[PDB]
C-alpha cells in the first residue's frame, strides 16, 4: 500500500535469494553445516541428529541422518501418540517432552536391536548421568541434539526431551547447565527439583495454588482435568505409568487412515485451483482490451 518503495529492475536483477529454508525462516545453515559435516576419514558414517521441534499443540522428536538427496528419518515420535500410553492433557509440556524423548530413544533402540542393554534410568531421581559404554559389548548409540532456531535457556523442554532420551538409552552428549534446578550462583544441580519438573511438579503446584487463590481461572484452564476426574496428586502416578508403558512397548502402531489416499486426493483436488492456459490468457487480454478502452 506504498509505492515509494518501488523495487526496481536492477534490484530484482542482481538480488541473490537466500536458500528456500532461510527465506521461510526454518533452518540455520551455519548450524546445519557444523552439525552435519562428518570427519571425512569415516567416509560414510552417518552423523545422527536428534531433531527436536516444538509446534503449538505438538512436540516432534525424530532421528535424522543426511544425504545428498535429502535427510532420512530413522525413527520419529510425536506427542499426539502419548494417549496410548496414558497422557491426554498437557502434551506440549516439559514432562511430555521427557516422555517423547524416552519414546524415541526406546523405539530406535528396539528397532536397532540394543534394547536389552542400555536400558538407561529406571529409577529416575533427576541425577545428571550419561549412558556409559558397556565393556564386553557394543557401544551406545550416539546422536546430537538439533534444536534449530530455538533459544538456549535453562528450564526448557528441548532439554527435557534430551534428558528423556539420555535416560532412555541414547548417548546424547550434554552438560547439566541448562536443566531446571541449575543453581547459578553456585554451580550444582538440584535433582529433587528436576524430578518434580519431570513428573509435573510445577503444573500440579500451580493447580493447587489456584485451588485456593482463584477458581475461575482454574475452571477455564484445566477444564480437561475436571472433566476427566483428575486432581493434582494423580499426575506423578500418571507419568510414571506412562514411562513404564513406553519402556514396555514403543513399537509405533500407526493409525487406520479412514478414507485413504485417493479419497483424500480427490477431496483436495475438488477445492484446489488449476492454473490456466495460453488460449485462456489471450482470451482474457482480448476481453480486457475490448472492455477498458472500448467503452461498450
Amino acid at each position: 500500500a506504498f509505492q515509494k518503495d518501488a523495487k526496481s529492475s536492477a534490484y530484482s536483477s542482481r538480488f541473490q535469494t537466500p536458500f528456500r529454508r532461510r527465506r521461510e525462516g526454518k533452518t540455520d545453515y551455519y548450524q546445519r553445516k557444523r552439525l552435519v559435516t562428518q570427519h571425512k576419514a569415516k567416509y560414510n558414517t552417518p552423523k545422527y541428529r536428534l531433531v527436536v521441534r516444538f509446534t503449538n499443540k505438538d512436540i516432534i522428536c525424530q532421528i535424522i541422518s543426511s544425504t545428498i538427496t535429502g535427510d532420512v528419518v530413522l525413527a520419529a515420535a510425536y506427542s499426539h501418540e502419548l494417549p496410548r500410553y496414558g497422557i491426554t492433557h498437557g502434551l506440549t509440556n516439559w514432562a511430555a517432552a521427557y516422555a517423547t524423548g524416552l519414546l524415541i530413544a526406546r523405539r530406535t533402540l528396539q528397532k536397532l536391536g540394543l534394547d536389552e542393554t542400555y536400558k538407561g534410568v529406571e529409577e529416575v531421581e533427576g541425577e545428571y548421568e550419561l549412558t556409559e559404554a558397556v565393556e564386553d559389548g557394543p557401544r551406545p548409540f550416539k546422536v546430537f541434539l538439533d534444536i534449530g532456531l530455538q533459544r538456549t535457556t535453562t528450564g526448557a523442554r528441548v532439554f527435557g526431551a534430551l534428558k528423556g532420551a539420555s535416560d532412555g538409552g541414547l548417548y546424547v552428549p550434554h552438560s547439566e547447565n541448562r536443566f531446571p534446578g541449575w543453581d547459578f550462583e553456585t554451580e550444582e544441580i538440584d535433582p529433587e527439583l528436576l524430578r518434580s519438573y519431570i513428573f509435573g511438579g510445577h503444573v500440579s503446584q500451580y493447580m493447587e495454588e489456584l485451588a485456593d487463590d482463584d477458581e475461575e481461572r482454574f475452571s477455564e484452564l484445566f477444564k480437561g482435568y475436571l472433566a476427566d476426574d483428575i486432581d493434582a496428586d494423580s499426575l506423578e502416578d500418571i507419568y510414571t505409568s506412562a514411562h513404564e508403558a513406553i519402556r514396555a512397548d514403543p513399537a509405533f502402531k500407526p493409525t487406520e487412515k479412514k478414507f485413504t489416499k485417493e479419497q483424500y486426493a480427490a477431496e483436495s483436488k475438488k477445492y484446489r485451483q488449476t492454473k490456466l492456459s495460453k488460449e485462456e490468457r489471450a482470451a482474457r487480454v482480448a476481453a480486457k482490451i475490448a472492455a477498458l478502452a472500448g467503452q461498450q
Partner: protein
Amino acid sequence: QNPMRDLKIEKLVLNISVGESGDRLTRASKVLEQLSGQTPVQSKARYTVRTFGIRRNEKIAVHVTVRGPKAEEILERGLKVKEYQLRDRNFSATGNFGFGIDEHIDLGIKYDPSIGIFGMDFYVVMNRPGARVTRRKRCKGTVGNSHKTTKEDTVSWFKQKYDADVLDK
C-alpha cells in the same frame, strides 16, 4: 469485517531527552519510574556535536516502554492535558502518533522538589493482532497490506474512542 482486524495499542514510549547527564537525568529517571512503575533506561549519544554540548556515550536521555492497561491509562491521563485535541499531523503514515507535553505535574504527579519539572514526549505505536509474524525468531514474515495500520484507520479509532478530534488542518 472486524473479527480480529481490530486496532489495539502495541506500546507507548515515554521519552525525556535531557540535554546532558547528571542529577538532572537521575531526576528524570525518578519521574518515569514513579509514573509507570517500571525501571527506565538511560540512552547514550551516538556522536558528538558540541553546539548542544554533548559527546559520545554521555548517557544523554532516558525512556521507557509501557504496554497494555497501564499504557492506555497513562495515555488518557496525559491526553486530558492536550484536551483530547490533536493535529491531523502528529500521525505517521504507518498508523502511529505522538505528542509532546511540558511540566509533567499536569498528570497528577506532586512536585517532589528533589525532582523538579520535566517535559516529555509520548509516542504511541499501534498494531493489529498478528504482529508476532514480524517480531518472532522462527518463520519471520511480513504483514499483509490488508492488515497494515494506516493514518486513516488510526484516526478513525482515535475518534471512535476518547470522543476526540483532529484539529489544526
